Amino acid sequence: YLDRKLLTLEDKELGSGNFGTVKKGYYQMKKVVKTVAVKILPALKDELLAEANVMQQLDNPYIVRMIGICEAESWMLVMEMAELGPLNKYLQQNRHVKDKNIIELVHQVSMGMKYLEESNFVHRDLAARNVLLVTQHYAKISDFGLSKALRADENYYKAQTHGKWPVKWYAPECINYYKFSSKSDVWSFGVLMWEAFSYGQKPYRGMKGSEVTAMLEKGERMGCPAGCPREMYDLMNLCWTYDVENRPGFAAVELRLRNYYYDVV
């Protein structure tokens, strides 16, 4: 547990939700300050501690690192700040990022997801808004509030209650059977790639999640973004394989992105 007296919070929020807010701050560690992002809040306490419990178990260059929890005026989860922020907003404001640079970033996300898959955690909210840029050439996955540690004997998490879900990033098996696996995250990764090569445009613009579900049941998918490399559009379509068993895992997806990235230059 962190000492609230060593944490200073800035006023401007990096994000918000029903839980509360995410704000920038500075945390005095031993001899220096660390720039941090802090999630600030009966059930929510448990969820935040669960979220922290997930981040505590993860250690990978492409996942946001948790500093710790701090109980003060409210419950806080202190994380290392990825100062460039969400990938979708960054590309919206920086339309001249090169396709090669986007490949590098999404490949980095796939390395982090490959690690998550190996560790047997499902993210359940993979999306461009939850890819944070440390630099224009270094991305980290964030926002583990919906993440679950899979049981040693199962390869999916079965949701009891359908809450407010990010339907546009979810695979059909999630929507129809409440079943969440690493392959479900692979589907989300495809949507994420689409967002990335579309410079942070929203997926399925103007459609209700229910209309997205119906479109996908018809075998229809989002089109190729302007200027998106063919091989990357092809990878998206592979990620959007309806049948979970035929859809690739992150091991395969990362390898494909690695080979393509290394082949550019």
Ligand SMILES: CN(C)c1ccc(-c2cc3nccnc3c(NC[C@H]3CCCNC3)n2)cn1
């Ligand atoms: C627009 N700008 C310049 C910035 C910059 C940084 C962040 C930021 C940096 C984080 N770093 C580490 C951990 N969390 C973080 C965070 N969290 C918010 C959330 C909200 C909801 C979606 N995902 C992200 N935001 C947000 N905006």
